[PDB]
């Protein structure tokens, strides 16, 4: 039995991160892309500016494309160096019995179930979605140096008129927005680090 993709010191050193977390903090959690093969994940905690984020590559590139275009705006090339195995790794270091808010919980719970955490709790804050998109340019403008990935064009499917483009979907902005609607209103501290999210690429003749 083991943990696939990191070895022992990456291992310990996300476990020696996760333990910044405050297990009975209010926690929110979002993705981008579909419970069965996510590519963007974070988690964020209010009350001391704590967050998770990083990335996956994608198992289905066809579904992948469909969400860009409609969803997240995150193009593939970005998702090359990041870390295998980080994803299972990071939610079996969440705390047991640990209670989780989210904006529909149904995705949410899908990706933990499918981790073997179904001790986990979740809180379904089933917002509107004009309640939840009411601080999104507020988040956007605040914190948009927090994620750099979502570099294309994301449209809104229309059966008639223009084109219409949307703001990009992003898992962290997420959180904070719909953190921003509960709370009435809206520094920020990464948990992991980024050495860890993205391997360092180096150069190599093709073999
Ligand atoms: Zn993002």
Redesign the pocket.
């Known amino acids: 039995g083991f943990t696939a993709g990191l070895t022992y010191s990456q291992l310990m050193t996300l476990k020696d991160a996760m333990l910044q977390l405050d297990p009975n903090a209010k926690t929110w959690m979002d993705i981008?892309g579909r419970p069965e093969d996510p590519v963007?994940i974070?988690l964020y905690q209010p009350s001391s500016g704590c967050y998770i984020?990083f990335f996956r590559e994608p198992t289905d590139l066809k579904q992948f494309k469909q969400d860009a275009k409609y969803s997240?705006g995150?193009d593939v090339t970005d998702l090359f160096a990041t870390q295998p195995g980080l994803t299972s790794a990071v939610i079996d270091a969440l705390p047991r019995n640990m209670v989780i808010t989210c904006q529909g919980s149904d995705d949410i719970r899908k990706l933990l179930e499918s981790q073997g955490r179904k001790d986990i709790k979740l809180i379904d804050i089933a917002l509107s979605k004009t309640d939840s998109r009411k601080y999104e340019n507020a988040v956007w403008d605040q914190y948009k140096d927090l994620?750099h990935?979502?570099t294309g064009v994301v449209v809104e499917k229309k059966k008639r008129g223009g084109k219409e483009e949307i703001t990009p979907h992003?898992?962290?902005?997420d959180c904070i927005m719909f953190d921003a609607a509960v709370s009435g209103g809206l520094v920020l501290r990464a948990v992991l680090p980024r050495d860890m999210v993205f391997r360092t690429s180096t150069p190599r003749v093709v073999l």
């Open positions: 981008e963007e974070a984020h997240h995150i994620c990935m979502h992003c898992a962290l902005m």
